Amino acid sequence: PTTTPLK
């Protein structure tokens, strides 16, 4: 679940 996209 813990996502981490750009920015």
The token duo for 6 is 């750009």
Which residue shows structure tokens 């920015």?
7
Experimental method: NMR
CA–CA separation, 7 and 3 (whole Å): 12
- Which string of b and e fits 1-7 if b means at least 16 CB within 10 Å? eeeeeee
Structure tokens, 3: 């996502």
DSSP letters for 1-7:
-------
Residue 4 to residue 2: CA distance in whole angstroms: 7
3-state secondary structure of 7: coil
